[PDB]
Design a protein around this ligand. Structure first.
Ligand SMILES: [Cu+2]
Ligand SMILES: [Cu+2]
Lengths: 340, 318
C-alpha cells in the first residue's frame, strides 16, 4: 500500500481518465467515483483497462470535501496563477489536499477529484500539497515538461510523435528532435536569445518558484521567511542574467516599458498549443497597445489607469519611507524589512 | 496648465500642492557643495539662467521633466488621418540647395567672431577690447518645396518643417515611437497656394525659429549659427520632414497689426498665431498602424534624405 508511489501515478497522462491505468497499475475506483459520463460504461472499462495490469490498487470510498470551487474552472479551459480568480481556486484545492487526515485519504480524494478538475490546476495544487505535507516528503515529482509537453514544445511535433508511435513498433522508434530558434527569424534580433527565453530549465525554474512560494493558500505554504525579498531578488537576478546574455548577442541592456500607454514594439508568437484547452496562446503583434480589461469570465474589470494608480501609490510609499495599513497605521520600509 | 504647474509660474493653479518643481530642482542641483551655507558659498552654474545650459546635468534634469510632460502627451488621441490631411493639397517634394554643394546636403564648419567687451570691463582703461569667439556655423541654404493645389480656389497653409536623425545610436533606421521626439523644428511660416502647382523657395536665414546673426555678434529666437546640427565629416544622415496644414483650422481668431507676417514676439503679440499644439504633428503617439515616418505621412507631407557634413576648418567671418 505504497500510497506515495501510487500518488505519482496521478501525474501519468493527465487527460486520460484514471481508470485507464497508469504505468503497469490500475486503480479500482468505486462506482460513485466515476464521472456521470463514464459510469454507464463501467462494465466495459473493467474489461480492457482493469485486467491488463500487474498491480491493481484498491481505493477505499470516503466522505469527500466540497470540490465545487476547484471544479468551477472548466476541463477544456486554460489555467493561470496570474488571474486572481484562478489563484483563489488553486488556493482552495491546495487547502483540501493539505487537510486530508491521512495519506490514504489523499489518494482517495485525488482519485475522485482528478477527472472532475482541469488537469493543469490539478497538477499545480497536488504538487504544492505533496511538497508541503509531512507524510509526502522525499517524493520525486515528475517534471512538468514530462507530463505537459504542450507548454514547452513547438505544437508541430505532436503529430510527428502521434504518427511515429502509431506506425512504428516501439523498439524501432526514433527520438523526435525538438525545434530550437523557431519562434522568429533573423529579421527579429530578439530571436537570438531563444536559448534563454525558451529553455525548459529556465521556464521550469519560474514554475518551481510559484510551487514553493505560492501567493494564496494555507498560511503554512504562503508564509515563508523573507519571501517578499526573494520575489525581488529572483526577478532581479533574471534581469541581470538576461542582460548578460544580451551583451553576448550584440544587443543593448533590456529597456523597461516607458509607460502603459505607448505601444509595445517587440511582438511574440509562441507557437504553442494547449491540448487541455485545444486553444493557442495567441501571439502579440508588433506595436500592440495595452488595453483596458473587461473579462467577465476571468472576473477582471480593470482599467489601465487602475494600474497607473497602484504604481503611483507604491512610489509615494517608497518615497515616504513607509506603507499605510488597512487601518491607517504606518509600517516603515526600514533597512531590514523594507525590501521584503 | 501643466507647464505653469511644473515651472511654477504665478499662473500655477495650486502652488501649495504642486510646488515649484523645476526652479527648486535647479537650486538643489547647484548647491550640493554647500546645502546649509556653512561654507558661505554661492550656487553653481545650474542656479543661474544665464549659465545653467553650460552644465551636462541641465539636459539630464530637463529630460526628467520632459518625461512628465510626455506622460500627459501620450494620453491624448493620436491625430486621425482626417486631422492630418489637407484635402486637395499634396506635397510632392522638398529639397535643400546650398551654394557649391550637391543637392540635399547641409554644411557646417567653425567660425571666428569678434565682440567688443569694452562696455563690460569695469575699471579697465577705455577703448575697444575685442574678444574672438570660436563657434559652429553652417553654409546658407534654401528649401525648395513643390506643392500641388487641385482646388479651383486659393488655399492658405502653414508650412511646418522639422528635421531628425535617420538612424538610432546603432545606425538602425529610427521608428516613429522614437523619431517623433527627435524632430527638430526648422521653420514655420504661412504661404498662399495658387490653384495647380506652386514652387516655394525659403532661405535658411528666414527661419522663424531663428533671429539674425547680427543680434548675437556685433523678438525671442534661436541663434542663426546653430540652426543646423554639427553632422559628421564622413556625412551624417537625417530625415527632413515638411507638412502643409490647413490654415483655416490653424487660424487664430485674434486680428492684430498680410497674414504672412509670422515673426512672433511674446511681448508684442497678445496671442500665439497657431491654434495647433506646439510641436504638431509629432506631439502625440501615432494612430493605429503607423510604425515609422514612411507610414505616418499624409499627401500634404513630404520626406527627404539629407546629408549633414562637418568640415573641421576655421573661416574669418566674410
Ligand atoms: Cu514569477
Ligand atoms: Cu530649468
Amino acid at each position: 500500500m505504497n500510497y506515495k508511489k501510487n500518488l505519482l501515478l496521478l501525474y501519468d497522462r493527465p487527460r486520460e481518465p484514471i481508470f485507464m491505468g497508469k504505468g503497469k497499475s490500475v486503480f479500482d475506483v468505486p462506482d460513485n467515483y466515476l464521472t456521470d459520463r463514464y459510469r454507464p460504461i463501467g462494465p466495459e472499462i473493467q474489461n480492457r483497462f482493469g485486467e491488463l495490469a500487474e498491480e491493481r490498487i484498491p481505493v477505499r470510498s470516503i466522505a469527500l470535501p466540497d470540490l465545487r470551487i476547484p471544479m468551477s474552472l472548466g476541463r477544456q479551459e486554460q489555467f493561470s496563477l496570474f488571474i486572481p480568480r484562478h489563484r483563489k481556486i488553486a488556493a482552495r484545492l491546495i487547502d483540501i489536499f493539505m487537510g486530508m487526515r491521512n495519506i490514504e485519504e489523499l489518494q482517495s480524494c485525488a482519485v475522485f477529484a482528478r477527472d472532475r478538475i482541469n488537469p493543469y490546476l490539478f497538477n499545480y495544487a497536488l504538487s504544492v500539497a505533496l511538497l508541503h505535507r509531512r507524510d509526502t516528503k522525499n517524493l520525486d515529482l515528475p517534471s512538468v515538461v514530462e507530463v505537459f509537453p504542450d507548454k514547452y514544445v513547438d505544437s508541430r511535433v505532436f503529430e510527428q510523435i502521434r504518427e511515429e508511435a502509431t506506425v512504428v513498433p516501439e523498439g524501432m522508434r526514433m527520438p523526435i528532435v525538438i525545434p530550437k530558434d523557431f519562434t522568429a527569424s533573423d529579421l527579429d534580433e530578439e530571436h537570438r536569445l531563444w536559448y534563454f527565453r525558451e529553455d525548459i530549465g529556465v521556464n521550469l525554474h519560474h514554475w518551481h518558484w510559484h510551487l514553493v512560494y505560492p501567493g494564496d493558500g494555507p498560511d503554512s505554504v504562503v508564509r515563508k521567511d523573507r519571501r517578499g525579498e526573494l520575489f525581488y531578488y529572483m526577478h532581479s537576478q533574471l534581469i541581470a542574467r538576461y542582460n548578460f546574455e544580451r551583451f553576448c548577442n550584440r544587443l543593448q541592456r533590456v529597456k523597461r516599458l516607458n509607460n502603459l500607454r505607448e505601444p509595445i514594439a517587440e511582438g511574440y508568437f509562441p507557437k504553442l498549443d494547449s491540448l487541455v484547452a485545444s486553444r493557442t496562446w495567441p501571439g502579440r503583434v508588433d506595436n500592440a497597445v495595452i488595453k483596458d480589461l473587461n473579462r467577465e469570465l476571468d472576473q477582471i474589470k480593470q482599467d489601465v489607469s487602475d494600474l497607473e494608480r497602484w504604481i503611483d501609490r507604491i512610489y509615494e510609499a517608497v518615497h515616504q519611507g513607509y506603507v499605510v495599513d488597512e487601518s491607517g497605521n504606518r509600517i516603515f520600509l526600514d533597512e531590514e524589512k523594507g525590501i521584503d | 496648465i501643466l507647464g505653469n504647474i511644473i515651472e511654477s509660474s504665478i499662473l500655477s493653479p495650486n502652488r501649495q500642492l504642486y510646488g515649484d518643481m523645476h526652479n527648486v530642482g535647479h537650486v538643489f542641483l547647484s548647491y550640493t557643495h554647500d546645502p546649509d551655507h556653512r561654507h558661505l558659498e554661492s550656487f553653481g552654474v545650474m542656479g543661474d539662467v544665464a549659465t545653467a545650459m553650460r552644465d551636462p546635468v541641465f539636459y539630464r534634469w530637463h529630460s526628467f521633466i520632459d518625461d512628465i510632460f510626455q506622460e500627459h502627451k501620450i494620453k491624448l488621441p493620436a491625430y486621425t488621418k482626417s486631422q492630418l490631411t489637407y484635402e486637395g493639397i499634396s506635397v510632392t517634394g522638398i529639397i535643400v540647395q546650398s551654394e557649391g554643394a550637391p543637392v540635399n546636403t547641409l554644411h557646417t564648419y567653425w567660425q571666428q567672431s569678434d565682440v567688443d567687451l569694452s562696455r563690460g570691463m569695469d575699471f579697465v582703461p577705455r577703448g575697444n577690447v575685442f574678444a574672438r569667439f570660436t563657434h559652429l556655423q553652417h553654409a546658407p541654404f534654401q528649401y525648395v518645396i513643390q506643392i500641388d493645389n487641385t482646388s479651383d480656389a486659393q488655399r492658405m497653409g502653414f508650412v511646418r518643417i522639422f528635421m531628425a536623425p535617420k538612424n538610432d545610436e546603432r545606425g538602425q533606421p529610427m521608428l516613429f515611437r522614437d523619431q517623433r521626439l527627435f524632430m527638430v523644428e526648422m521653420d514655420k511660416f504661412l504661404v498662399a497656394l495658387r490653384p495647380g502647382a506652386n514652387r516655394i523657395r525659403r532661405r535658411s536665414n528666414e527661419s522663424t525659429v531663428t533671429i539674425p546673426f547680427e543680434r548675437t555678434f556685433r523678438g525671442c529666437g534661436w541663434p542663426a549659427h546653430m540652426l543646423v546640427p554639427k553632422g559628421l565629416p564622413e556625412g551624417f544622415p537625417a530625415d527632413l520632414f515638411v507638412m502643409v496644414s490647413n490654415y483655416e483650422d490653424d487660424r487664430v481668431v485674434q486680428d492684430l497689426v498680410c497674414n504672412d507676417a509670422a515673426s512672433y514676439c511674446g511681448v508684442r503679440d497678445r496671442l500665439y498665431p497657431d491654434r495647433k499644439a506646439m510641436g504638431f504633428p509629432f506631439d502625440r503617439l501615432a494612430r493605429t498602424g503607423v510604425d515609422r515616418l514612411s507610414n505616418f505621412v499624409t499627401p500634404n507631407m513630404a520626406i527627404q534624405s539629407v546629408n549633414v557634413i562637418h568640415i573641421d576648418k576655421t573661416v574669418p567671418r566674410t
